[PDB]
Amino acid sequence: KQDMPPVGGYGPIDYKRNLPRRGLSGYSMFAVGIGALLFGYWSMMKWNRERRRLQIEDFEARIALMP
Amino acid sequence: TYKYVNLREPSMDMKSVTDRAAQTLLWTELIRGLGMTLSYLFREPATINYPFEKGPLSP
């Protein structure tokens, strides 16, 4: 008399197949790429030109002496 | 009965190619997917220390 089949309690689990967790698509990408890229170029011309100012300063001490 | 899997024609319009162009060029694929499903490292290692621990059996 002690056999298995239970009265209730069932799901089931799915046979489904989906995980569309997107994801900033469709022209939202290529937008964070370009602006941060020119931001790095914007970081230039305030350092290389600044080091160029120090570069003439470095060559200044050479020319002032040597007579 | 039937099911036709991997049977789907592409979109081929102006905007949806930008989802397939950002995929190849900037790799929004292969990192959001495959760099996150590996890590997934923080789970507990289910290893039996055999000379000390032992596994289950049946009568």
Curated annotation (Swiss-Prot), chain A:
The chain crosses the membrane at residues 24-45. Coiled coil: none annotated. It comes from the Eukaryota. It is found in: Mitochondrion inner membrane; Nucleus. Belongs to the complex I NDUFA13 subunit family. Accessory subunit of the mitochondrial membrane respiratory chain NADH dehydrogenase (Complex I), that is believed not to be involved in catalysis. Complex I functions in the transfer of electrons from NADH to the respiratory chain. The immediate electron acceptor for the enzyme is believed to be ubiquinone. Involved in the interferon/all-trans-retinoic acid (IFN/RA) induced cell death. This apoptotic activity is inhibited by interaction with viral IRF1. Prevents the transactivation of STAT3 target genes. Complex I is composed of 45 different subunits. Interacts with CARD15, but not with CARD4. Interacts with STAT3, but not with STAT1, STAT2 and STAT5A. Interacts with OLFM4. This is NADH dehydrogenase [ubiquinone] 1 alpha subcomplex subunit 13. It comes from Bos taurus (Bovine). The lineage of its organism: Eukaryota, Metazoa, Chordata, Craniata, Vertebrata. The chain holds residues 7 to 73 of 144 of the full protein.
UniProtKB/Swiss-Prot annotation, chain B:
It is found in: Mitochondrion inner membrane. It comes from the Eukaryota. Core subunit of respiratory chain NADH dehydrogenase (Complex I) which is composed of 45 different subunits. This is a component of the iron-sulfur (IP) fragment of the enzyme. Interacts with RAB5IF. Core subunit of the mitochondrial membrane respiratory chain NADH dehydrogenase (Complex I) which catalyzes electron transfer from NADH through the respiratory chain, using ubiquinone as an electron acceptor. Essential for the catalytic activity and assembly of complex I. Belongs to the complex I 23 kDa subunit family. This is NADH dehydrogenase [ubiquinone] iron-sulfur protein 8, mitochondrial. The gene is NDUFS8. The chain holds residues 37 to 95 of 212 of the full protein.
